[PDB]
Amino acid sequence: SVFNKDERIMDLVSKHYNVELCAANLYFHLATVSKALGYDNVAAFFVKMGSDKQSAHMSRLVKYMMKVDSILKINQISVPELVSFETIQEVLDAALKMESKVRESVKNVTEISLLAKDFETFERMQWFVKDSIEDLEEISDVWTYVHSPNVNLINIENIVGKKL
């Protein structure tokens, strides 16, 4: 291809796609867990988060790879490691860990692409640098609500409903 992208950097872009999809996959799982625990609005929140990963993150990554004629590889990175959840607090713990890993993945691809003088990839990653902050803040806020002392299921449902 005339774009002659380095396969190391493109593999990192592909890996970050798998990390965003791993998050999406986890969030759709956590939506069903949250609902079964009685948290309809927390469940809808996770559906929104997973849908956003598809429509805003994964879509930008696959579109960028096509712009530079590079190949997206899906693999086992995309499948989240599932533990058992007994409380809505444990659900949010897992979501916070996942989104924090998305953010670290963004930072890694951003740093390495700049190191490698791949300014096209560095430029495409800037949207993700900014938006990873937003996504981590959203999950962090809901983690705060469910971990706050002396809150009840209705309190959690009510305030999370205001993020939909």
**Which residues are known binding-site members?**
40, 52, 57, 131, 135, 137-138, 141
Give the integer Cα–Cα distance in Å for 121 and 67.
11
Half-sphere exposure of 105 (CA within 13 A, CB side): 26
Taking the complex as a whole, how short is the minimal distance between the CB of residue 30 and its own copies, in angstroms?
9
The nearest distance, CB 160 to Fe ion, in angstroms, is 10
Q: Hey, what are 72's tokens? A: 């997206």
Token representation of residue 61: 């990554």
Tell me how far apart the alpha carbons of residues 144 and 163 are, in angstroms, rounded to a whole number: 14
What SS3 class is residue 39?
Answer: coil
Residues 6+ apart with CB under 8 A from 37: 85, 87, 88, 91
Nearer residue to Fe ion within complex by CB, 78 or 127: 127
Both tokens of residue 40? Answer: 């309809």
Binding residues for Fe(3+): 40, 52, 57, 131, 135, 137-138, 141
- With CB under 8 A as the contact rule, the residue among 23, 25, 91, 92 that binds its own copies is 25
Listed in sequence order, the residues at least 6 apart from 79 whose beta carbon sits closer than 8 Å to its beta carbon are 22, 25
Verify binding: residue 111, Fe ion, rule CB under 5 A: no
- Residues 132 to 151: which contact Fe ion by CB under 5 A? 134-135, 141
What is the residue whose two structure tokens read 């380095």? 6
Window 49-88: contact mask with its own copies (x via CB under 8 A) = --x--xx--xx--xx-xxxxxxxxxxxx-xxx-x------
Q: Is 51 in the site for Fe ion (CB under 5 A)?
A: no
Q: Which of 83, 86, 134, 164 is in the footprint of its own copies by CB under 8 A?
A: 134
Smaller CB separation from Fe ion, 115 or 126: 126
Please report, as residue ranges, which positions from 5 to 24 form the binding site for its own copies (by CB under 8 A): 21
List residues near Fe ion by CB under 5 A.
Answer: 40, 52, 131, 134-135, 141, 155, 158
